[PDB]
Design a protein that fits this description.
The complex is a heteropentamer of chains A (240), B (129), C (57), D (279) and E (341). Chain A is built from 7 helices and 6 strands; from the N terminus they run H-E-H-E-E-E-H-E-H-H-H-E-H. Chain A is α/β, with parallel strands linked by helices. In chain A, helix 3 runs parallel beside helix 6. The longest helix of chain A is centred in the first third of the chain and has 30 residues. Chain B is mostly beta strands and 129 residues long. Chain B has one domain: Immunoglobulins (Immunoglobulin-like, Sandwich), CATH 2.60.40. In chain B, a hairpin with a 4-residue loop joins strand 6 and strand 7. Classes of the chains: A alpha/beta (240), B mainly beta (129), C mainly alpha (57), D mainly alpha (279), E mainly beta (341). Bound molecules: 2-[[3-(trifluoromethyl)phenyl]amino] benzoic acid. Chain E: Belongs to the WD repeat G protein beta family.
Chain lengths: 240, 129, 57, 279, 341
């Protein structure tokens, strides 16, 4: 009948409009890279969030969703803040994120085990076994001061320090003592050993020692994200 | 039945002594779970101490207890044992035995959280002199 | 006294759980069987409806 | 004369063997994946289409040489020649520009640059590949029109005409190959820049595979130029012209199938598995 | 005196278990052993709705069995016309993290929620065109997981803050709150008579609440792991559950204990969605193994496999007439299944 045909035509027109809008949003979604910021209370996640809120015009009950452009590339960095300590079910919403930026205090020397277990859970989670993690060992200066001043000994908490030496592929900052290199790379290698002793060939860790200047921090994030997308495109194209 | 984990063995011991911890379990198939041991020193949070796989192949310990405590997993009796050796006052706490949230998986995510169902009331291991 | 309050709340919940009329599982079995049999014919997924009346064809 | 003819004939036989092997094996592994309800990615769909077109092309050349060897009479009916060149032009156009489309897919998905136009093409690689096929439809029209014009002129008036027509075909195939080579070099340059970016960022099988592929585009570059320049200048052909043109025509669909077998992870794994089962 | 309260707690729990056992005489598998099995039932993807930009997290049919709303983490609520596989409405969302979506029984409202902790209600039949946020229900100190409209004006939303609530849309405040779950509450189903609802949490237990009072009447238990999917048996006297322990369970309201566990040795991944059929005989449950297994309700036998999803299934529901079942998964694809004659 005529009225039913008119209704069908109107519904098809609505479909065309919605499909055009959905293609536009698919374009903006493919362009945008979603990064997840994770860390503990003592980790410098809050400092990074406060910095990026105003540096990149952060949009802002506890989801800190910000969308920014760096070198014409779209990023969507977010931190789950309103949720409680349980993390095993709202983390499943982040199985498709480009990267999980992991922030570790690296100078507590006491809560490092909690950070290690958190990294274990993120890496070995069944729904995050694809997602690369950008390891951000924050507060490197504080760890340097702690090691230089002595007092507390990392051997008390982590006992493998007594049988560890700097790897030959070491990149110390120009003027800086050997002991702080040993401590810093011990932490980095603890995390890296936890990462590698698992399924490989799908997700990789990107250790980084956070420096005072945050431009290098952003540059490391950008380079790691580009690497992740390059490897993913290799996987889809089959050249891997 | 309701998932339960009852700890036992907590007691006062002089420094350098030994203690045994037992975690009777019921209501779930004990075999397919990465059982862990968590503890609460006074005025502190929940710290993970040790864990064991389904069959004991992979065991890990907190660095502070690397050479001091052992973990045994008797799948027949559905009991997890945390052998406590060479105790020092830094170890005084209430010890909770906790189960990994999901079976056949190694992602123990929420074990040290403030509230967690798959755990127990725990026993107080006092190492006062 | 927060732990005391939580304990009181949970024991109260168990108490109101106790004073609940409970019937044998066999009667629930019979009720489920009766409901399944009564509406088995009208269920399209249990017995595939003829394609003529099917709207998802 | 005779010695070069025999050598080129043996080369053609080897190319026919390797082309059938590679092309049919790509088609077979993809068909097995499809029938068994496995994952079917876009790149393997393009590989299936390219492999089918390529096996069709190599069988076409083998049939043509069979006509020119086991029945030297059908080759000169003046109408079968026209039919064969029309079918060959169509199928080879499809094969060559489907290869260029695969190159576009790889370049637009893997490579990374800050140029606005590259990004504008980057998020619609499907749009790029089908718009490219639609655009090169007009190239197909131009090639078919030129081929009919040339053969009509020949019929009105053919060794010199054959040299001219294969020269036209060589140019029409060189252009898309030039595009593919530029795209591949850009892709490798992007990977190089990224690799040293990561090396400053600290962070073997790919190197072997990459090294082999550039050997092709270095080997094909000199081989392609030699065929074009010779027909343009050297007259040591005629009967040799048929065998040499067949060699060049069969060169790409076989050795490029080998490069693709070295490229795709599924294809490489299947080749290694067939080698393991062989012994 | 906390030890005395604990002693009373275990004494009451033992008494409740003893009462359940005394009411436990014959297993439902025993009585339904004589029930003729439905046999191998095959269904096919009559219509595969596509257009969702990212993974699908929830779906809810309409009362008219024609319109369904699906939520994706892209930040969209696409309303589909299943009979004609066309998109009727697409609602852009403020927060991309959506974990629930509800279609009002009247058809004039939709719901959504997620990590933003706010339940968003949308009008579909505004005096002018286009869809707009009607009200934003705020007050849940945790991620919303499941929401269902009691009526055109009331809505009961479940959150990860270990406490469900019933809201008034015009008022915007929690009229009644439901506390008692230790862990994160994830699922929520409404009885055929809108008087009671049940919600299963991450405490490996499910509780039944009375809407007009606010205290949970019963606390069904038994699952080894967290209960991640719940649904109501059509009769209104039973409800089925889904847990990451790979064993769906059926609990009846009256006897108040386990009735059967829908289990298989091969199945080791967790259920994600559970929804009974119209006759209640077919229990359709989806798993992380990227396909759905239809379970006979009266017998613990796998009726069929609804294979066709690349990624894990997240939602599953049947129309009010049971004509078809639509299952959405994380491959951004929602596919309707209908029995084949
Ligand atoms: O094969 C072509 O013609 C090609 C062209 C452009 C870009 C890539 C191409 N092929 C290809 C196939 C597999 C692996 C790689 C490389 F390793 F270079 F990335 C390149």
């Amino acid at each position: 009948t005529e009225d039913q045909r008119n209704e069908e035509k109107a519904q098809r027109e609505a479909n065309k409009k919605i499909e055009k809008q959905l293609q536009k949003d698919k374009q903006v979604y493919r362009a945008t890279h979603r990064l997840l910021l994770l860390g503990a209370d003592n980790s410098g996640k809050s400092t990074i969030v406060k910095q990026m809120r105003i540096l990149h015009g952060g949009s802002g009950s506890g989801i800190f969703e910000t969308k920014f452009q760096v070198d014409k590339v779209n990023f969507h960095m977010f931190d789950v803040g309103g949720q409680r300590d349980e993390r095993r079910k709202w983390i499943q919403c982040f199985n498709d994120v480009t990267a999980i930026i992991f922030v570790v205090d690296s100078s507590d020397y006491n809560r490092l085990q909690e950070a290690l277990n958190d990294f274990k859970s993120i890496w070995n989670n069944r729904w995050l076994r694809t997602i690369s993690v950008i390891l951000f060992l924050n507060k490197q200066d504080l760890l340097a001061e702690k090691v230089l001043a002595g007092k507390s000994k990392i051997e008390d908490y982590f006992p493998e320090f007594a049988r560890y030496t700097t790897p030959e592929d070491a990149t110390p900052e120009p003027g800086e003592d050997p002991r702080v290199t040993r401590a810093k790379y011990f932490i980095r290698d603890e995390f890296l050993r936890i990462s590698t002793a698992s399924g490989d060939g799908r997700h990789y860790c990107y250790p980084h020692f956070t420096c005072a200047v945050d431009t290098q921090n952003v540059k490391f994030v950008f380079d790691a994200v580009t690497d992740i997308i390059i490897k993913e495109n290799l996987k889809d194209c089959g050249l891997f | 039945m309701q998932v339960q984990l009852q700890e036992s063995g907590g007691g006062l011991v002089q420094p350098g002594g030994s203690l045994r911890l037992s975690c009777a379990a019921s209501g779930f198939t004990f075999s397919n779970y990465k059982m862990n041991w968590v503890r609460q020193a006074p005025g502190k949070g929940l710290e993970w101490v040790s864990d064991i796989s389904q069959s004991g192949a992979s065991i890990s310990y907190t660095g502070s207890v690397k050479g001091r405590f052992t973990i045994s997993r008797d799948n027949a009796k559905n009991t997890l044992y945390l052998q406590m050796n060479s105790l020092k006052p830094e170890d005084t706490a209430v010890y909770y035995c906790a189960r990994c949230p999901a079976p056949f998986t190694r992602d123990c995510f929420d074990v040290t959280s403030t509230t967690y169902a798959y755990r127990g009331q725990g026993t107080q291991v006092t190492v006062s002199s | 006294t927060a732990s005391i309050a939580q304990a009181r709340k949970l024991v109260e919940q168990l108490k109101m759980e106790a004073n609940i009329d409970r019937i044998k599982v066999s009667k629930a079995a019979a009720d489920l069987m009766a409901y399944c049999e009564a509406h088995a014919k009208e269920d399209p997924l249990l017995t595939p409806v003829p394609a003529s009346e099917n709207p998802f064809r | 004369g005779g010695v070069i003819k025999s050598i080129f004939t043996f080369v053609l036989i080897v190319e026919f063997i390797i082309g059938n092997l590679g092309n049919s094996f790509i088609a077979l592994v993809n068909c097995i994946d499809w029938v068994k309800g496995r994952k079917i990615s876009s790149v393997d769909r393009i590989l299936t289409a390219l492999a089918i077109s390529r096996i069709s092309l190599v069988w076409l050349i083998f049939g043509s040489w069979c006509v020119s060897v086991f029945f030297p009479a059908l080759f000169a009916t003046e109408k079968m020649f026209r039919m064969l060149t029309n079918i060959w032009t169509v199928i080879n156009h499809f094969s060559v520009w489907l290869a260029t489309g695969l190159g576009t897919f790889y370049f637009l998905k893997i490579a990374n640059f800050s140029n606005s136009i590259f990004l504008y093409l980057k998020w619609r690689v499907k749009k790029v590949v089908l718009v490219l096929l639609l655009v090169t439809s007009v190239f197909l029209f131009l090639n078919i029109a030129l081929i009919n014009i040339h053969i009509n002129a020949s019929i009105n008036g053919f060794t010199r005409f054959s040299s001219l027509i294969v020269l036209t075909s060589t140019v029409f195939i060189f252009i898309p190959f030039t595009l593919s080579l530029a795209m591949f070099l850009l892709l490798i340059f992007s990977m190089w820049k990224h690799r040293k970016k990561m090396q400053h960022t600290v962070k073997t099988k790919a190197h072997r595979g990459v090294k082999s592929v550039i050997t092709f585009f270095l080997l094909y570059a000199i081989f392609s130029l030699s065929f074009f320049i010779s027909v343009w200048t050297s007259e040591r052909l005629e009967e040799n012209l048929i065998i040499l043109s067949q060699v060049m025509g069969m060169a790409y669909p076989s050795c490029h199938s080998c490069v693709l077998i070295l490229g795709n992870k599924k294809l490489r794994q299947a080749s290694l598995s067939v080698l393991l089962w062989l012994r | 005196e906390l030890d005395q309260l604990r002693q009373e707690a275990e004494q009451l729990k033992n008494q409740i278990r003893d009462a359940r056992k005394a009411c436990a005489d014959a297993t439902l598998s025993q009585i339904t052993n004589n029930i003729d099995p439905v046999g191998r039932i095959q269904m096919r993807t009559r219509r595969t709705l596509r257009g969702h930009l990212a993974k699908i997290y929830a779906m809810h049919w309409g009362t008219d069995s024609r319109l369904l709303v699906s939520a994706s983490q892209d930040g969209k609520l696409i309303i589909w016309d299943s009979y004609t596989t066309n998109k009727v409405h697409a609602i852009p969302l403020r927060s991309s993290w959506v974990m629930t979506c509800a279609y009002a029984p009247s058809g004039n409202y939709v719901a959504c929620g997620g990590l933003d902790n706010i339940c968003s209600i949308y009008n579909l039949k505004t005096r002018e065109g286009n869809v707009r946020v009607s009200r934003e229900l705020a007050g849940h100190t945790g991620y919303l997981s499941c929401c269902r409209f009691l009526d055109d004006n009331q809505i009961v939303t479940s959150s990860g803050d270990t406490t469900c609530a019933l809201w008034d849309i015009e008022t915007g405040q929690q009229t009644t709150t439901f506390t008692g779950h230790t862990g994160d509450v994830m699922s929520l189903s409404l009885a055929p008579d809108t008087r009671l609802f049940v919600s299963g949490a991450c405490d490996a237990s499910a509780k039944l609440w009375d809407v007009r009072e606010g205290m949970c009447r019963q606390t069904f238990t038994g699952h080894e792991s967290d209960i991640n999917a719940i649904c109501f048996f059509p009769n209104g006297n039973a409800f089925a559950t889904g847990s990451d322990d790979a064993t769906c369970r059926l609990f009846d309201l009256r006897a108040d204990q386990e009735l059967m566990t829908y289990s298989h040795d091969n199945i080791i991944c967790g259920i994600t969605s559970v929804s009974f059929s119209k006759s209640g005989r077919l229990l359709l449950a989806g798993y992380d193994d990227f396909n759905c297994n239809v379970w006979d309700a009266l017998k613990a036998d796998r009726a069929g496999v609804l294979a066709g999803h690349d990624n894990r299934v997240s939602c599953l529901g049947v129309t009010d007439d049971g004509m078809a079942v639509a299952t959405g998964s994380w491959d951004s694809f929602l596919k309707i299944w209908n029995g084949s004659s």
